[PDB]
C-alpha cells in the first residue's frame, strides 16, 4: 500500500507526531490525506518543503 506522492501540501503535529498532508500522484485532490512522517519515503520533497517554509 505504497503510492506515488506528487507534493506536500501542509504539515502539522497531532498527538505529538509530525504529519504531512499529501497530494497523491494521479489521484484527485479529494483524496489528499494526512500521513505520519514515518509513512513517507520522500526525502527530496520533505527537505524542499522544510527549506521553503
Amino acid at each position: 500500500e505504497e503510492f506515488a506522492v506528487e507534493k506536500i501540501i501542509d504539515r502539522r503535529v497531532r498527538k505529538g507526531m509530525v504529519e504531512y498532508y499529501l497530494k497523491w500522484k494521479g489521484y484527485p485532490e479529494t483524496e489528499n490525506t494526512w500521513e505520519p512522517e514515518n509513512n513517507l519515503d520522500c526525502q527530496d520533497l520533505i527537505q524542499q518543503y522544510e527549506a521553503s517554509r
Binding site: 505504497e2 503510492f3 506515488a4 506522492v5 497523491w24 490525506t33 500521513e35 509513512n39
Partner: peptide
C-alpha cells in the same frame, strides 16, 4: 517519492 497510505 512514495508513501504508505493509512
Amino acid at each position: 517519492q512514495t508513501a504508505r497510505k493509512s
